[PDB]
Amino acid sequence: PLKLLTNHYERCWKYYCLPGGWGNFGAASEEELHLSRKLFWGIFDALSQKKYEQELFKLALPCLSAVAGALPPDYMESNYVSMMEKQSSM
C-alpha cells in the first residue's frame, strides 16, 4: 500500500528517477512472489498517464524484456493480465 498510494496522491511527473530500477528488475527476472512489481505498472497503465499524451520510448524496453521473458514464467496463471495493457492506453 505505501508504494501503491503515495505515488497517486499529489504529483504528476515524479516517475523518472524511480523506475530505472524497475526496468533493471524487469530485465532481471519475473518472480511470481514479486508480482507487485508488475502491479505498479498495471496501475500506472491508466493512472500514470494523467492528461498530456507523452512518450512511449522509455517504456518499450520493459515490454521487450517481458517479450523475452514470455518463455520462463509458468505457474503464475493469474498474474498474466498485468503485462498486457501497458501499450494500449499510453
Binding site: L56, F57, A60, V67, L71, D74, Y80, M84, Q87, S89
Partner: protein
C-alpha cells in the same frame, strides 16, 4: 535517416514486431495444433494481438501509410488460417475490432489475402441453400456454430467506402447473392436462432448483365451498369410487399429481409434512382404498421429491427389505440390485481418493449419531424 517502422519509428515497432512474430510463430505452429511454454505464449499473443490497441482504427489511422495495409493484411491472413479450428481460445467477438480496423479499404493489390479469406468463406457462402453436414468448414462441431452468424453480421461490415476490387461480383458474390434469392422462403435449417444474422449487407452490385457477359467480364463490372442490378434487386420488393397476412405471428421475418435492401440503406443509386429512397422505403415503413401492431406476434421474434409524412399519422393513431389498450389494462390491474407472475408482468413487459421500440424508431428521425409538424 529514414525513420522506418522497424528502424526508428516506435509507433510502427509495436505493430511490426508483433505481427511478424505472430506470422512466424502461430502460422508455423498451426500444424502442431492439429494432431512447456508454446501454449502459454500462444494464449498470450492471441489477446495481445487481438487487443494490442483497443482503438484499432486509431492505431492504423495515420501512424504510417503502407504499414497499415501490410499489417491489416497479415492480421486478417492469420485470422483466416486458424478460423477453421475449434480450440478453446475464443476470438469471434475480437474479430469485430479487426474488421472495424479496415474501414477506419486500402490498396489490396499488394496481396490477395482478402481473396483467400473470401474463397474460404465461399465454401458455404450461400447459407440456407448449402446448410447441411457439408456446411462451412464441413463441420459437425468444428466451425459450424453460433459465432459465425455474428461474425458474418458485424465483421463483414464496411460502411466507409467500397474501394475494393469487387471483380467476382458475377460469380463469387453473385453465388451467395442469387442462391439466397432462389426463393421467397429463406429456408434456414435447425437451431435457427436467427436467419437474418447473415448481414444487412446487400445493395445494388455491392439473369444479370455482368454475368450475362461472363467472357466479357471474366472489365464491365455489374456496378458500372446500374440498370441490371436495379431490375432484379427491386423486382423482389413487390413480391414481399404482396406476401402478408392478417395474423401477425405467422410472418416474423417478413419485415427484416425487406427493410435492408428496400429503404435508404442501399447507397448504390439511392440518389440516382429515387424509387429506392422513396417508394420501397414507403412500403417498408407502411408494412410494419399492419405487421407489428397485432398482439399475436410477440417481441422475441422481431426484437431488434434497428432500421415518412404519410404513415406518421397512422403510427400515431394506432399507437394511441395501443396505449389506450394499455391504459385499460392498467385500470384492470388496479382493480383486483391478480397474480402478476403468470401473464400480467409479461404482458406489461411486452407492451413496454413494443412501445419503447416504437418510440426509439420515432426518435431516430420521426420525433424531430413530429415536432416540426406540430409547430407547423
Amino acid at each position: 535517416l529514414s525513420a522506418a517502422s522497424r528502424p526508428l519509428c516506435t509507433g510502427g515497432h509495436a505493430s511490426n514486431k508483433e505481427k511478424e512474430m505472430v506470422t512466424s510463430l502461430f502460422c508455423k505452429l498451426g500444424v502442431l495444433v492439429r494432431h512447456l511454454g508454446q501454449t502459454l505464449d500462444a494464449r498470450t499473443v492471441m489477446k495481445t494481438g487481438l487487443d494490442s490497441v483497443k482503438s484499432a482504427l486509431r492505431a492504423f489511422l495515420d501512424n504510417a501509410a503502407e504499414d497499415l495495409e501490410k499489417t491489416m493484411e497479415n492480421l486478417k491472413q492469420g485470422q483466416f488460417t486458424h478460423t477453421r479450428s475449434q480450440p478453446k481460445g475464443v476470438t469471434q467477438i475480437i474479430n469485430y475490432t479487426t474488421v472495424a480496423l479496415l474501414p477506419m479499404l486500402d490498396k489490396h493489390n499488394v496481396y490477395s489475402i482478402y481473396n483467400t479469406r473470401s474463397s474460404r468463406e465461399r465454401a458455404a457462402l450461400s447459407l440456407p441453400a448449402n446448410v447441411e453436414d457439408v456446411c462451412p468448414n464441413i463441420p459437425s462441431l468444428e466451425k459450424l456454430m453460433t459465432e459465425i452468424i455474428e461474425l458474418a453480421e458485424s465483421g463483414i461490415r464496411y460502411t466507409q467506402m467500397p474501394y475494393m476490387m469487387e471483380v467476382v461480383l458475377p460469380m463469387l458474390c453473385s453465388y451467395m447473392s442469387r442462391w439466397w434469392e432462389h426463393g421467397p422462403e429463406n429456408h434456414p435449417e435447425r437451431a435457427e436462432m436467427c436467419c437474418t444474422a447473415l448481414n444487412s449487407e446487400h445493395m445494388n452490385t455491392l439473369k444479370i448483365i455482368y454475368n450475362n457477359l461472363g467472357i466479357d467480364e471474366g472489365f464491365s463490372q455489374p456496378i458500372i451498369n446500374k440498370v441490371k442490378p436495379q431490375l432484379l434487386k427491386t423486382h423482389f420488393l413487390p413480391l414481399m410487399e404482396k406476401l402478408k397476412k392478417k395474423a401477425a405471428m405467422v410472418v416474423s421475418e417478413e419485415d427484416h429481409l425487406k427493410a435492408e435492401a428496400r429503404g435508404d440503406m442501399s447507397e448504390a443509386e439511392l440518389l440516382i434512382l429515387d424509387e429506392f429512397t422513396t417508394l420501397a422505403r414507403d412500403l417498408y415503413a407502411f408494412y410494419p404498421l399492419l405487421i407489428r401492431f397485432v398482439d399475436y406476434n410477440r417481441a422475441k421474434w422481431l426484437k431488434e429491427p434497428n432500421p415518412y409524412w404519410s404513415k406518421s399519422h397512422n403510427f400515431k393513431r394506432e399507437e394511441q389505440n395501443f396505449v389506450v389498450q394499455n391504459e385499460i389494462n392498467n385500470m384492470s390491474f388496479l382493480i383486483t390485481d391478480t397474480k402478476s407472475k403468470m401473464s400480467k408482468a409479461a404482458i406489461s413487459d411486452q407492451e413496454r418493449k413494443k412501445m419503447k421500440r416504437k418510440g426509439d424508431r420515432y426518435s431516430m428521425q420521426t420525433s424531430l419531424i413530429v415536432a416540426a409538424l406540430k409547430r407547423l
